[PDB]
Design a protein around this ligand. Structure first.
Ligand SMILES: O=C(NCCCCc1cc2ccncc2s1)c1cc(-c2ccc(F)cc2)cc(O)c1O
Ligand SMILES: [Cl-]
Ligand SMILES: [Cl-]
Ligand SMILES: [Mg+2]
Length: 213
């Protein structure tokens, strides 16, 4: 089996069904004690939580689900009726994410879209009945952060106040995205310095709030 399957099984055997906090703990324990994996982790997760609680978004888009750690993190804090759409290119990971959300009891809040962001973003309005997004979590290929931000704007999916929150802007890093949003009058940006998941290595989140054209 794969590392991702082992993380899912560990959750199934060491967390409580329907308890998202126990799911997060189990993943963080496994990834600390057994095998590193690219979940956002607890250090950066705490900053995500604070952001989610500040904005109480009704409709969140996530690029890059992986095993569902960030989707569980965000969905557990959503208000009733609020929704998360998460896009995952790897079908094995899409299936693990679905099972992770099922175990956590969050499946009614989250729709896991298996496919590439550059193919799926243009379908959001018509296919998934999206008007505009309240928040976007970027956690996919680091060289896609900038092109997908520009694609989101092109598609009319951003509104005044839409919050972009971007993982890994330091490690592995997303230099073009950071330079673009930080230099654009269409974004108000804040950096939240933290640590790479499960490591004593500096990383951070970028929050970039869209201001309109
Ligand atoms: O690559 C990372 N994350 C993206 C995986 C790409 C998955 C995709 C999902 C999807 C959905 C839709 N369209 C297209 C795509 S492409 C990543 C890597 C590290 C890291 C840090 C230090 C290391 F030494 C080694 C890895 C840490 C992280 O937190 C990451 O998130
Ligand atoms: Cl994650
Ligand atoms: Cl961590
Ligand atoms: Mg990441």
């Amino acid at each position: 089996d794969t590392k991702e399957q082992r993380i899912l099984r560990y959750v199934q055997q060491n967390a409580k069904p329907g308890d998202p906090q126990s799911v997060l703990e189990a993943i963080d324990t496994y990834c600390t004690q057994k095998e590193w994996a690219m979940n956002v982790g607890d250090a950066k997760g705490q900053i995500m939580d604070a952001v989610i609680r500040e904005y109480s978004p009704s409709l969140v888009l996530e690029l890059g689900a992986y095993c569902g750690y960030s989707a569980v993190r965000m969905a557990r804090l959503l208000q009733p009726g609020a929704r998360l759409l998460t896009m995952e290119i790897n079908p094995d990971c899409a299936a693990i994410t679905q099972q992770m959300l099922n175990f956590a009891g969050l499946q009614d809040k989250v729709t896991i879209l298996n496919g590439a962001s550059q193919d799926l973003i243009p379908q959001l309005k018509k296919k998934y009945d999206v008007d505009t997004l309240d928040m976007v979590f970027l956690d996919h290929w680091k060289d896609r952060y900038l092109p997908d931000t520009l694609l989101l704007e092109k598609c009319g999916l951003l509104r005044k106040g839409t919050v972009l929150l971007a993982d890994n802007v330091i490690v592995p890093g997303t230099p073009d995205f950071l330079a673009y949003v930080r230099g654009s009058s269409s974004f108000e940006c804040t950096h939240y310095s933290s640590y790479l998941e499960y490591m004593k290595v500096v990383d951070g989140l970028e929050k970039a709030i869209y201001q309109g054209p």
